[PDB]
Amino acid sequence: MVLSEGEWQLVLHVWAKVEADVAGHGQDILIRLFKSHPETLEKFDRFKHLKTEAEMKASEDLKKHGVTFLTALGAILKKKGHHEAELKPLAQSHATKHKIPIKYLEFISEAIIHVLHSRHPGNFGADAQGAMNKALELFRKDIAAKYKELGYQG
Ligand code: HEM
């Protein structure tokens, strides 16, 4: 699929706001994901044990991963679609080492959209959400094709 420059603009305009606090958005998003879809916390051998949202908020490791994953996503979105190089090592490690099904990438895309909507209502109206959703669907479709080339999930 292909986004128009206008759509990339809306995505990078609200992302510039997220970047003012990467560790805070990374936490919110992961907690939203784990509270909504608790089965996803099982994939993390380092935090699996956390039982509550308070314990999640206080975990430094969880916050460190939030910064790690969000930074990578930000580096992919900034490419505006030209992200083949970036995707390769990510698809390999999520398909062979972590084993993250496409369905989970859809769950975290819903978490990203829930948090941006909460924190940035003004910069995340309907058109800006439609664009963000398109950019994440583009990210999932390319990762899913790479997963098939790599022998995973199919
Ligand atoms: C927006 C999509 C996502 C991005 C950009 C992303 C990015 C990353 C990055 C950069 C790392 C570190 C390097 C590596 O191992 O590849 C990582 C590790 C990891 N990611 Fe993902 N990720 C995404 C979605 C997910 C989801 C949905 C899950 C699980 C339900 C997941 C599970 C993990 C796990 C288990 C590790 C290892 C963490 C630790 O042991 O240090 N990722 N991810």
- Euclidean distance between CA atoms 67 and 23, whole angstroms: 5
- Euclidean distance between CA atoms 152 and 136, whole angstroms: 20
Task: Evaluate: CB of 46 within 6 angstroms of ligand 1.
Answer: yes
Domains of the chain: 1-154 (1.10.490.10)
Annotated binding site for nitrite: 65
Resolution in A: 1.8
Residues making up the chain, counted from first to last = 154
- Asked if residue 103 lies in contact with residue 147, where contact means CB atoms within 8 angstroms, the answer is no
Task: Evaluate: CB of 95 within 6 angstroms of ligand 1.
Answer: no
> 20 Cβ partners below 8 Å, 6+ apart?
none
Would you state the structure tokens that stand for residue 99, as one six-digit string? Answer: 């084993």
Would you state the structure tokens that stand for residue 18, as one six-digit string? Answer: 């997220």
- Euclidean distance between CA atoms 74 and 85, whole angstroms: 14
Task: Evaluate: CB of 17 within 6 angstroms of ligand 1.
Answer: no
Pocket test for ligand 1, best of 32, 42, 94 (most atoms within 8 A of CB): 94
Task: Evaluate: CB of 99 within 6 angstroms of ligand 1.
Answer: no
Plot region of 152 (φ>0 → left; ψ -120 to 50 → alpha; else → beta)? beta
Where is 77: in which H helix or E strand?
Answer: helix 60-77
| Side chain identity, residue 140 | R
Angle (nearest 5°) at CA 13 between 10 and 15: 110
